[PDB]
């Protein structure tokens, strides 16, 4: 269940992404 | 391998013996007796020559009910009866600093391993010695504790002696006979002697036969230092507790009530003031205007016991000060204990240990388990009851249409409990839980200190190990990881406890913790008092206890620079645990390169000076302590403004 | 998000309000003049469980629509708070207060002589 | 200002004519150990058994277990020592000598010589107890090495070519022998280390690969500070063998100091005194000697238990320095003049202590 | 600027702090020994109606309370890429919204420029 | 940290306080009774130069002995502190307050009767 765990965590990070 | 050579780890157990450790504690008992002895020579009220003695301080009230308890200290207004206290408590200062300098010099050399006498012309053994000579022969068969589990039967005889003494010089010296009546202070003589056989009966049966529970404590200084250290904080507790209900019962009254009867004019207090074109003479003031007319120019006013309620206020002061420290003690214990469950775990001993107080948490299965109750049970208790103090708040404002019937009046403690409570209210049931949740709040960050010292749950899962115990964090990796080491969860255990460390502060000095408004000048504040019949009309509310409070604080000049010294003290943690430290880094670089440069341009020779700046982990350090110092510096003025709660409840306005 | 989970939470708000209406029997407190014993505990009640019941749907509904924004809300979530706003403002002006206040015969007081001079009669 | 050191000594001591001793010592040092590469530990083990008592051969083994700056480094040794004459002592064992992946075994038919300067009887007379013993000492060495790797090949290739191209080899191989601060402990131990003789370099087959074989022959002479030459009846209790003998030991070292461990019994710890009294074995001069060579560089404080525990009847008739305490058949050392000779013999003094325990 | 604030806000808070002490008769002093008679300059006493000492401290605290915001809006200016620390560090602000580069260095929270925003509002 | 480092300070502390000096002379600023002209800017100036001085040298002199403290100072700092907090006691009664509170009579006031007594009349 680690992955599925780790694709949360990467769902939510410090990099570029489109925020509200 | 994490550095060790700051200078606030000097004295760790990693670079101290048993024999140095037996050398720092004496050496400290000695300046501790040092310390007693000028309690005692500033609480002279009048000289033995006649000369007029010291103001009141702080330092000797908390202390004072219990040498006039013991006969040292008199509570007599007449000088004649205070000329010889005077003289007492200088023969027990002088008394104290002779016994200190041989503690002091029974420290040193134990420090130095140097146990040489010069007398007897020879060298005792740390290792095997008979005990103060044919006592020690008869009872410990002519030989020495080896270890810390056989050092339990010398150590308890030891305090069996310390006893039997204590109840010696009470009879002896201060007079006071062994009569076995628990209203009387000759009972704290019987009792030093019931005490010191039931000690050498138990340190006879632990001499012969050793503890082997926690058998791995005996291995490391600093695991059985911890334990210790976990226990001793809890007694602390327990003693403020007990000082509490004990110091203000009927048979306590000869000594902590009578000092509501008594002035005291302590120092940094209003004094007698005067006009700006004051010029005093020694024989009269001339062209000059003085306030009172009644003291000499810059006399310290006195001050009522009385209004002040000096008897509560005291029993405040001693309560107080044993538990915010037992608090402190717990929360090391937990933390120099996980410092010592990081080592076990680095260098594998952790699953070899067969004791059960290592061994029961040993499985992360339980440990989440363990950990989801104390979270589970926090959360149920810490919306239980703010929900209820954020309920009566909105009624007795009437906010969203609700009035001071609709509150919880009705709720207080049950039946069965009331006997706690001399007075039953809706601020009884909320202030147990309260604490309830108080303690379990800052149980999360030492239950986290006890299981995930090294690895969690989720850095099991995230493949990462926790190297120390003060690495601030690993990076922005993850979304951010900072705050993971024993040392920040233990910062997280004194921060959160500031909590449940201020419903006690706020408890003891008769405040309102059912409403955070209790006694304003609104629509049902001061409808509390009948609307739930209580016989004690409370100081404030949770918010209105800084108004009234302050009043008196304000009133003292040096009561109100202690104000300002800890919010000072306080804000300035800001600047070392907000996220800033990259920030602070580059800055001062720009100030080293902009002095260089302005001693460059401004001074032919060219200086430079490389300006420092805190790590997190000695950010996150001096952050607490400015954070803790500066938010107690402060709540020392919530119990020393007065106890102002009074037995006379309120009408409701209508 | 069905069944159980829903019944879990109504049924547990349910026996809470037992729980406290059961505590006032067995705290046995003087209860307020002109108030019955058994809607005192049933008026706290309902009070925290709005308040907490306020909170979790709050949290729940900006978690549900911090991330549905996008550029088709430009007119329709600028167009609902106004929508907020305005019935709050009819709202005020006709459940919380009916009218500017007048006295008991029904005269208006705006100036600082008639505040200085009604008080003294 | 100053360091501290703190240990543990303790020897037990049977009754008649056993010289069957327990020795147990525990040692822990503050100051950093004098290697130049740390941390560097190291498990040492001894075994010796009895093969016949006709004979008086014995079987004895050695294993190293070291790891130095974080290179294991192993050596083995089993060996069958036994005494030919009172100055001729052969031994036939094979070894393996192990660094990181590299090991290779070798075999040994060894002989050893020992001869005194002099033999008077005058001293033999006038001497109750003698200390130094002038002499000097043969080796006799047959190493059978395989030259399996295509390291050891060459270390073969190149010795034999500098044998053959260089004249001083039998002298300057003794700087080789003794690498960096061994070579200083020569002079220091009063011991003159000969130059070596190669009675043969040749390559014999062996079923396994080539095996180079050396056959070669020194010695080496005492001032009589070598205790080797001094006592050599001493070291080699075979006839008193009776029963297994084994010392193990080990030591743990690095920047913050050293930590050691030693145990084990073996008979000549209790030797014949005169006038019907028995007396602890003469302190070896070597080991003193040679700790005084790294033991001068830290000021130290010194915290010594030395428990001796004596047989049955068996009471001490004299002792300098005199024990602190005594607790019936044991008796104790620790602190005043001990803790002096302990700091006197850890610096490279070389003091007599003496123990007399009679009947 | 960073010169500038410092000589202002020490100059200034000393001012209100020893005001303070000499008001609160700490230290033996009366409020005869405290900066009474500072208040601003003739030429700019038309600024301020009734000026006293709380107009000089109220110029001179603007002052301050600008130069010391001034600070994180510099470093927005000129580093929002690079500074001389990371330039000598050898790293690139990639971003004007990361926390930090992890522990690193004694640590080098609050760098970017976003951050250097908050520094400027707090 | 030699020459004009120290020079440096020196004279910026002459400078600030010939300025707060200077100043005076033309704020326009009517002085207290029985003060001089000259004196009230010398003793404000003084007041705050001790201030910011007294500040800086416990900033570097802890800092001086945060980095040069060890096992060394296990008996003499625990003796410094008793030492300091000693002499300051003594100061409470030898150079702050000379005794307790007494009358100009010469007369003590102990009690809270006596006190109230003493408020009425
Ligand atoms: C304050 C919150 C925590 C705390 C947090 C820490 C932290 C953080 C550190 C220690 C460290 C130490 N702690 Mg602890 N510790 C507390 C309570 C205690 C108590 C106690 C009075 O019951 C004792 C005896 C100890 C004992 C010790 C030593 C084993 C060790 C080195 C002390 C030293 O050199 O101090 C400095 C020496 C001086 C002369 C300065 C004055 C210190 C006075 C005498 C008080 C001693 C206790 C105090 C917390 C020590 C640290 C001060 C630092 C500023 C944090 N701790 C409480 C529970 N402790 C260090 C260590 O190595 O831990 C593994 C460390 O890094
Ligand atoms: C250290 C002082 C002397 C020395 C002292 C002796 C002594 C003494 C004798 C030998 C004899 C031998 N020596 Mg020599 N020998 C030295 C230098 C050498 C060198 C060399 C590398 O230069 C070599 C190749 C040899 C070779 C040899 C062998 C041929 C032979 C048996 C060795 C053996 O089995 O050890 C076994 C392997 C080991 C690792 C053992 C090491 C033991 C240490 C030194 C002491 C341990 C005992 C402890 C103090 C007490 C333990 C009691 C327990 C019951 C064991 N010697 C130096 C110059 N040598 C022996 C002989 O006579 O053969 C006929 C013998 O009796
Ligand atoms: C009420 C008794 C408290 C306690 C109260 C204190 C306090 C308070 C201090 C120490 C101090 C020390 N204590 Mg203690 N001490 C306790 C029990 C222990 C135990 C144990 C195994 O139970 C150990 C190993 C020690 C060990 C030590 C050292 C860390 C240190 C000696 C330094 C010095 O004196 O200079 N304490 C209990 C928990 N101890 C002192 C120190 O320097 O701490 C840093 C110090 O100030
Ligand atoms: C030891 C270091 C200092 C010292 C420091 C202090 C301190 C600190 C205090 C006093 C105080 C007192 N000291 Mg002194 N004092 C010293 C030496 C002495 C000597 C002496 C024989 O030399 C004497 C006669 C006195 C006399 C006295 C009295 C005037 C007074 C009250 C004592 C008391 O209640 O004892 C009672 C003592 C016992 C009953 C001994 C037993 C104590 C036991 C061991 C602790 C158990 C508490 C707790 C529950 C622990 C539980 C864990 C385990 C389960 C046990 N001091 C030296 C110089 N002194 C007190 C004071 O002034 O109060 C206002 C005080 O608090
Ligand atoms: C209050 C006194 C302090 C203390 C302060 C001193 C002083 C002072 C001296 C020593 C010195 C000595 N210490 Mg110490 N030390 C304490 C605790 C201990 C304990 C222990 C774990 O209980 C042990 C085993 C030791 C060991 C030793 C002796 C071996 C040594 C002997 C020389 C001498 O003059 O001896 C006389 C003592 C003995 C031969 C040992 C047997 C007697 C007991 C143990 C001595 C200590 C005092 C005794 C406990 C006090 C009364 C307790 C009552 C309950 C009031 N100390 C006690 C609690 N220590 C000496 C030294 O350092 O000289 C440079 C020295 O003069
Ligand atoms: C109506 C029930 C009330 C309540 C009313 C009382 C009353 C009345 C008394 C106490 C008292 C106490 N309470 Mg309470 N208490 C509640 C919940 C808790 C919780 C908790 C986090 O679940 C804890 C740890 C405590 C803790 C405590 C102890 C300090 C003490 C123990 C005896 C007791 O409860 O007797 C009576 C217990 C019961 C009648 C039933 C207890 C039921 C358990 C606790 C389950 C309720 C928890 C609930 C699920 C929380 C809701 C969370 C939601 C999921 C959001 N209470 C709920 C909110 N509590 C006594 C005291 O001394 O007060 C000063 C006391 O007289
Ligand atoms: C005795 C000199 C006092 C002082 C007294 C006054 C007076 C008086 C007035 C002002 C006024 C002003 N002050 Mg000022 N001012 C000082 C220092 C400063 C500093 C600074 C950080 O160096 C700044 C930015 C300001 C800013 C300002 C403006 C708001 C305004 C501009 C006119 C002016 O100064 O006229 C007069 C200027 C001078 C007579 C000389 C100025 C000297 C220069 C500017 C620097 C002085 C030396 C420096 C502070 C050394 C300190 C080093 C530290 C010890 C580290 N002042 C020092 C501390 N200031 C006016 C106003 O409107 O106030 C409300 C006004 O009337
Ligand atoms: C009184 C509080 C206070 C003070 C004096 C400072 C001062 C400073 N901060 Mg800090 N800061 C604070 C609170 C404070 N900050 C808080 C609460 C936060 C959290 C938001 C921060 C966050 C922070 C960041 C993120 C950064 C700084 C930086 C700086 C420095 C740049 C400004 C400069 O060069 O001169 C400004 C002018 C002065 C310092 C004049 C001196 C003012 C008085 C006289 C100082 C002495 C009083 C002091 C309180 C005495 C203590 C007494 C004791 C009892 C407590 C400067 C040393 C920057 C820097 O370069 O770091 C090194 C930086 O990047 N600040
Ligand atoms: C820091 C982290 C966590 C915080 C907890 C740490 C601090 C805890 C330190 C105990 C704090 C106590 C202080 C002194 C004791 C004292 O007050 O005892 C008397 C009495 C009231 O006395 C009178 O007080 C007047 C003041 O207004 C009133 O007006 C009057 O009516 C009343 O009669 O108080 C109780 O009965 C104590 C209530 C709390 C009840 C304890 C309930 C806890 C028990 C259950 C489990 C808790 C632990 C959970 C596991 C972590
Ligand atoms: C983010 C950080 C910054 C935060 C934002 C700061 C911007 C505001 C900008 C300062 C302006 C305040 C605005 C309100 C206007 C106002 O008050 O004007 C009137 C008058 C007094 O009026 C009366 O006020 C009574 C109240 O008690 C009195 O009792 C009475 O005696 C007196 O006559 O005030 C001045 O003259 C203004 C003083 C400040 C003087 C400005 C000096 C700054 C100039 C120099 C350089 C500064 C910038 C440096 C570079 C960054
Ligand atoms: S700001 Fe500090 S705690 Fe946060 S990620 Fe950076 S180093 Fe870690
Ligand atoms: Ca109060």
């Not at chain 2, 501790?32 to 006649?50: A, C, E, H, N």
């Not at chain 4, 530990?41 to 058994?49: A, E, P, R, S, Y």
């Amino acid at each position: 269940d680690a992955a599925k765990m780790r694709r949360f965590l990467f769902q939510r990070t410090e990099t570029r992404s489109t925020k509200w | 391998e994490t550095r060790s050579t700051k200078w606030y780890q000097i004295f760790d157990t990693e670079k101290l013996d048993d024999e140095q450790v037996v050398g720092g504690h004496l050496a400290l008992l000695g300046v501790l007796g040092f310390i007693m002895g000028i309690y005692y020579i500033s609480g002279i009220q009048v000289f033995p020559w006649g000369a007029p003695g010291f103001h009141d301080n702080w330092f000797y009230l908390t202390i004072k009910p219990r040498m006039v308890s013991l006969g040292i200290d008199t509570y007599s207004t007449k000088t004649a009866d205070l000329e010889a206290a005077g003289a007492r408590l200088l023969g027990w200062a002088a008394f104290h600093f002779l016994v200190g300098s041989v503690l002091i010099f029974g420290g040193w050399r134990h420090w130095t391993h140097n146990l040489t006498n010069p007398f007897t012309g020879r060298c005792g053994n740390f290792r095997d010695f008979r005990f103060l000579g044919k006592f020690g022969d008869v009872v410990f068969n002519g030989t020495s504790a080896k270890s810390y589990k056989e050092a339990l039967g010398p150590h308890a005889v030891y305090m069996s002696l310390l006893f039997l003494g204590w109840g010696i010089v009470m009879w002896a010296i201060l007079g006071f006979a062994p009569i076995p009546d628990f209203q009387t202070i000759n009972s704290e003589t019987f009792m030093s002697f019931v005490f010191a056989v039931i000690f050498f009966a138990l340190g006879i049966y632990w001499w012969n036969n050793p503890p082997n529970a926690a058998i791995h404590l005996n291995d490391d200084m600093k695991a059985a230092f911890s334990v210790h250290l976990t226990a001793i904080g809890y007694i602390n507790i327990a003693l403020g507790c007990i000082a509490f209900v004990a110091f203000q019962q009927p048979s306590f009254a000869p000594y902590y009530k009578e000092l509501d009867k008594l002035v005291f004019y302590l120092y940094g207090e209003p004094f007698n003031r005067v006009s700006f074109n004051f010029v005093e003479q020694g024989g009269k003031v001339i062209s000059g205007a003085k306030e009172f007319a009644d003291f000499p120019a810059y006399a310290i006013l006195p001050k009522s016991g009385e209004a002040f309620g000096m008897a509560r206020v005291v029993t405040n002061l001693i309560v107080f000060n044993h538990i915010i420290c037992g608090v402190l003690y717990v929360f090391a214990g937990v933390y120099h204990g996980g410092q010592y469950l990081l080592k076990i775990q680095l260098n594998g001993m952790y699953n070899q240990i067969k004791s059960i107080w290592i061994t029961k948490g040993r499985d992360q299965e339980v440990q989440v388990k363990i950990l989801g109750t104390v979270m589970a049970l926090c959360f149920a208790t810490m919306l239980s009851v703010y929900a209820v103090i954020v309920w009566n708040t909105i009624c007795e404002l009437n906010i969203f249409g609700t009035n001071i019937t609709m509150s919880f009046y009705w709720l207080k403690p049950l039946p069965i409990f009331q006997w706690m409570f001399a007075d039953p209210s809706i601020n009884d049931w909320v202030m147990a839980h309260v604490i309830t949740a108080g303690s379990l709040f800052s149980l999360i960050a030492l239950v986290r200190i006890a299981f995930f010292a090294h690895t969690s749950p989720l850095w099991d899962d995230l493949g990462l190990k926790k190297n120390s115990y003060s690495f601030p964090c690993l990076g922005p990796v993850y979304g951010g990881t900072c705050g993971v080491s024993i040392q920040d969860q233990l910062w997280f255990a004194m921060l959160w406890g500031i909590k449940g460390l201020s419903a006690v502060c706020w408890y003891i000095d008769g405040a309102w913790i059912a409403s955070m408004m209790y006694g304003v000048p609104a629509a049902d504040a001061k409808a509390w008092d009948s609307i739930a019949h209580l016989h004690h009309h409370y100081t404030s509310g949770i918010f209105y206890y800084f108004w009234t409070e302050t009043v008196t604080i304000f009133s003292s000049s040096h009561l109100s620079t202690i104000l300002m010294i800890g919010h000072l003290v306080w804000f300035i943690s800001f600047a070392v645990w907000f996220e800033d430290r990259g920030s602070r880094l580059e800055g001062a670089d720009i100030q080293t390169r902009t002095i260089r440069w302005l001693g460059k341009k401004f001074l032919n020779r060219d200086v430079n000076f490389r300006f420092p700046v805190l790590t997190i982990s000695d950010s996150k350090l001096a952050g607490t302590f400015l954070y803790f110092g500066g938010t107690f510096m402060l709540v020392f003025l919530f119990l020393a403004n007065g106890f102002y709660q009074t037995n006379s409840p309120l009408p409701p306005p209508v | 998000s069905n069944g159980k989970l829903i019944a879990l939470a109504v049924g547990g708000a349910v026996l809470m309000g037992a729980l406290f209406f059961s505590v006032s029997f067995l705290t046995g407190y003087i209860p307020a003049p002109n108030h019955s014993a058994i809607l005192t505990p049933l008026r706290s009640f309902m009070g925290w469980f709005l308040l907490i019941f306020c909170a979790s749907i709050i949290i729940m509904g900006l978690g549900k629509m911090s991330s549905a924004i996008s550029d088709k809300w430009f007119l329709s979530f600028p167009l609902s708070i106004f929508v907020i706003v305005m019935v709050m403002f009819l709202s005020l002006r006709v459940y919380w207060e009916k009218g500017r206040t007048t006295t008991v015969d029904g005269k208006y007081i705006r100036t600082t002589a008639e505040l200085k001079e009604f008080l003294n009669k | 200002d100053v360091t501290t050191a703190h240990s543990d000594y303790e020897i037990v001591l049977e009754g008649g004519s056993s010289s069957w001793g327990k020795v147990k010592a525990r040692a822990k040092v503050n100051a950093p150990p004098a290697s130049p590469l740390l941390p560097a530990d190291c498990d040492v083990k001894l075994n010796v058994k009895p093969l016949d008592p006709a004979k008086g051969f014995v079987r004895i083994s050695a294993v190293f277990e070291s790891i130095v700056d974080s290179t294991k480094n192993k050596l083995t040794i089993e060996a069958d020592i036994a005494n030919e004459t009172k100055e001729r002592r052969i031994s036939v064992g094979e070894g393996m000598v192990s660094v990181g992946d590299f090991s290779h075994t070798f075999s040994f038919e060894g002989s050893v010589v020992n001869l005194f300067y002099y033999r008077s009887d005058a001293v033999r007379r006038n001497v109750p107890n003698p200390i130094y013993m002038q002499g000097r000492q043969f080796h006799d060495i047959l190493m059978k090495v395989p030259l399996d790797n295509n390291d050891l090949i060459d270390t073969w290739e190149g010795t034999v070519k500098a044998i053959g191209s260089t004249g001083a080899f039998n002298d300057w191989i003794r700087d080789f022998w003794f690498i960096g601060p061994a070579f200083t402990a020569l002079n220091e131990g009063g011991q003159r280390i000969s130059r070596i003789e190669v009675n043969g370099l040749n390559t014999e087959s062996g079923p396994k690969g080539p095996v180079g074989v050396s056959r070669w022959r020194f010695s080496h002479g005492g001032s009589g500070m070598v205790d080797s030459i001094s006592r050599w009846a001493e070291l080699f209790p075979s006839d008193k063998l009776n029963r297994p003998a084994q010392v193990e030991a080990g030591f743990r070292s690095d920047s913050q100091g050293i930590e050691v461990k030693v145990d084990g019994e073996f008979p000549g710890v209790s030797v014949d005194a005169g006038g019907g009294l028995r007396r602890i074995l003469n302190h070896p001069l070597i080991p003193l000697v040679h700790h005084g060579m790294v033991g001068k560089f830290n000021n130290f404080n010194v915290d010594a238990q030395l428990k001796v525990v004596l047989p049955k009847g068996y009471k001490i008739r004299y002792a300098a320095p005199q024990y602190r305490s005594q607790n019936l058949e044991e008796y104790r050392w620790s602190g005043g003049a001990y803790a002096r000779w302990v700091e006197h013999v850890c610096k490279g003094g070389v003091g007599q202590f003496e123990i007399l325990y009679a009947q």
